[PDB]
Design a protein around this ligand. Sequence first.
Ligand SMILES: O=C(CC1CCCC1)Nc1nccs1
Ligand SMILES: O=C(CC1CCCC1)Nc1nccs1
Ligand SMILES: [Mg+2]
Ligand SMILES: [Mg+2]
Lengths: 546, 546
Amino acid sequence: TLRAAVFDLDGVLALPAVFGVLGRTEEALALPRGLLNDAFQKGGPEGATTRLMKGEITLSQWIPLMEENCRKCSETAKVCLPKNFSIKEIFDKAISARKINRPMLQAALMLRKKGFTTAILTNTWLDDRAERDGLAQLMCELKMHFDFLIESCQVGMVKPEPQIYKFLLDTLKASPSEVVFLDDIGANLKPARDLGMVTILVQDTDTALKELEKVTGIQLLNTPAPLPTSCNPSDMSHGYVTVKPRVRLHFVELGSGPAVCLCHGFPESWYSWRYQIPALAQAGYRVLAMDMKGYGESSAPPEIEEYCMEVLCKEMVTFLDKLGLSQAVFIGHDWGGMLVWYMALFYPERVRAVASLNTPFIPANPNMSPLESIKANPVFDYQLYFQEPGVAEAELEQNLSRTFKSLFRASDESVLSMHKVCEAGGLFVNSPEEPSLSRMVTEEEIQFYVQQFKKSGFRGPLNWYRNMERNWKWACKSLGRKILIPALMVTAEKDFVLVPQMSQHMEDWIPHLKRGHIEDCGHWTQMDKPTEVNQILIKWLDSDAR
Amino acid sequence: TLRAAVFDLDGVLALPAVFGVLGRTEEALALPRGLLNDAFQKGGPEGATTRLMKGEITLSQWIPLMEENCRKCSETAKVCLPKNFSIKEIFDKAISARKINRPMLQAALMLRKKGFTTAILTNTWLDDRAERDGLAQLMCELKMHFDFLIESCQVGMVKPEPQIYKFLLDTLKASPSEVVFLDDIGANLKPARDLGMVTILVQDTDTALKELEKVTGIQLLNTPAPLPTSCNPSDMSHGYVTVKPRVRLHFVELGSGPAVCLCHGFPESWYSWRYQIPALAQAGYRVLAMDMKGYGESSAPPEIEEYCMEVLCKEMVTFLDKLGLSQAVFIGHDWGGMLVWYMALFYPERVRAVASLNTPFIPANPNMSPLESIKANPVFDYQLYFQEPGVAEAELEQNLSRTFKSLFRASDESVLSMHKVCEAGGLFVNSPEEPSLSRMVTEEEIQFYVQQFKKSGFRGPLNWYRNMERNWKWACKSLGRKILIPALMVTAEKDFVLVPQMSQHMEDWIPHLKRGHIEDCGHWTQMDKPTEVNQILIKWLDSDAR
Ligand SMILES: O=C(CC1CCCC1)Nc1nccs1
Ligand SMILES: O=C(CC1CCCC1)Nc1nccs1
Ligand SMILES: [Mg+2]
Ligand SMILES: [Mg+2]
């Protein structure tokens, strides 16, 4: 029967509420109990505070008016205000003290995900303080998780005026009794209830959630830890740069601050970073998530050498050049991991810092042809399979759904070994026609990749493997160097191909190397352990990249 | 006969040269004359410095080696090195002391513009110092102005080795005697001369330029002040955001740092900011230059109300939301100017700062229908012409070349009055079929705009004028407010439509308003006085937006 959920902000999605600082400040300065509240509410519907909540005046216009009200309130209660009493200072501290109430946000998320229309209905102000950005950021972080955010000052109405609920009901396209509305002020509930809305007086978060659990019949309290926020491709800023006449790079861009450039592996997509993209934006960074050369909406010229590391790197440099970036942090995984290491080696002036998921930095062996080197490790037999232009393409492009559903599996869910692939004559010779969907990906997520590879298929991605000799020669020019820029290596316990021990001697070449390890994590690091990944990268960026 | 120009970096495009700090440091610390040079050059072709210039080692690898060389040089000359003598410190100060040599850069520009292939040929290093970004930035600023930048450490060769000149001649696709090469070190010229290149030993910049003037037969010294760098559309990072199901905004993006969002007027384009885009990137900003709703590669839905200020603003907010920006600086001109003021008024939390070129902030008259208000000023008669859907479109879309060549004129070059346009029955009734090209724009620049408007024509742009009533009603909700966020107004002496005196009472509503004035500047502010515009905006951003 219930189809919509409405959440107050102050005292519901964000804690502590600011009327909570009103009261503390009083005790703090030993003023008359509730004096600051009287001043705040002075004149009711025609008072400074209503005119503010309605958008008639801005916050900075209201501050002196509140000063007056406190002068008048203090005069009538026969007390003096303290030396250097300041409404701006009190309200600054207050506003910046409030933080997202994680459990509530997460409950709203859950409800949204099980089909509810969610909204924030709040009395709030046009904030023009020097320090306004703080709140802007909060409001951003929150709004992206809700169908609507209705703000008193944007619509000209306030709680408890009954007109705002009519506006509410109308925005929701719902009837009074399909809505649950949670708010910390009883008065605000009063008219919601009159129209027939389920309401919840929010005191402690957990009881509110219990009532909301009981009334919606959906588990919200004590639910398992949720995944990090993902990206809807069609809500992203998509960017395009021609690095040279035939070749354009596509990227997706979110957040602001230092530039972090995300370099996916084989056979993937900018989408492989869906769980990192918001987290890093959120953490104060300018995420640029690439479609690497050969993939997605990036160009896929057919020639093999268009994909050697040197050309790939020169091209990432031009990418920075034309976008006007003097540096970026480079974070890569799988093949993208190889590339960021080579970026640190041949363009350190352009790399603020470098990090790889899974891909070790192993220097080339100048006394051993790299093809010979690769036969030395049976776990790498599939790379030989990839050599002959066309063979691997035909297997991979034959069923796209099949392919990704086969590759994109967690460690304990495997359906393919990379063992004797040449012998067997293929990657999927001994794996199902219709694989079960792994617990790591939804049906829709598989289709995304499917629709991407429909553009160019696998020639371009596969070409990344088809320059062993050219890349070796080039790498050898760098045997004299060391990586002395900040550098993080992250190993995945259960990557059976890029195994953690391959990284063991990396400190010989990267002396200040910082490390992270992820237990119980297969080869598809980002989607397998998104939470652990974000935690490791955000901590490392914060200490090494600012 | 001469077809290419090559410029050294250190001591030619960038001053002071670092061997210049080598020598000063000696005197400074009263060391043996030239001791630091011997150390620097120790072992010639097999010495630390060559291995570095060739890319065998990184800068940070070389630093201790140079320390040793200075220990050995000082021991052999029988002197002690000072307490806390430090190669890193000397070279940091040095590298960061060098600045672009404007006259040389400008000379190279000129030559490029008259058809020369230009290159930088430099001995340089893979820089991995903590402070490497400084040089990266220089190298960026410079490279964008040259066909090639060949770096010793990227190609494995150095000046004076003859192989680098062969590589040079080959990259240029030119023969020894079509090349002029200017360098500050005589030895580097030696092999250029052997192959038959015109060379120039660069001591003082002006004499070098005189020789280069004499030898190319092109004026380089004492030439008039050049325009700011422009943008080639196809070298830009182009971005796309869907703000809602039918509607996408296109923008061009350059630089990094605080987000500055550029909002063009009627009937224009992101391109109208071509002279601002590099300047601001250069000045440390993230320029986002819009195609506004209805223009260029942005959507152009046909309905009139899709273009009222409220919807336009809500849409710019969604633009920030999806791009992950909590604020941006908004800079607008003409209609874009109206919009940024309304952004400051209805979304100050999202506006870091606001600035308008030409467009005053005049608050709505709540006692006078805006159509009536517009008949009160004969200079605004053309806006009435624009009311009737279709009329203005047919005139404007009939000859696109004609239209922009007619509009885009400097003040003293006018071919149309905005006077009695209704009476006359059109904007161009009394103006030429084929106008002369104004001194403000090239033929190619006019074609760009032409090709843009071919996508949607003028319905969408014209609709911006077709919400007088709706916009008025909305504006009236804001009569109580003031703009208290940082705000710059820039008037144009010779804008005969948006005249400077229209801005006279703006301080009543914007108390901290900062002002700029441009003399001898028509309505198309950005292309008419690009240099003055960049100077005003960059100074104001630096003080009010950081
Ligand atoms: O090829 C892979 C990943 C494979 C594992 C599963 C399918 C692709 N790694 C690398 N090879 C070379 C450098 S990084
Ligand atoms: O219409 C213009 C500019 C015109 C002058 C030359 C052609 C267009 N200004 C504005 N009107 C309303 C707000 S800003
Ligand atoms: Mg509340
Ligand atoms: Mg030099």
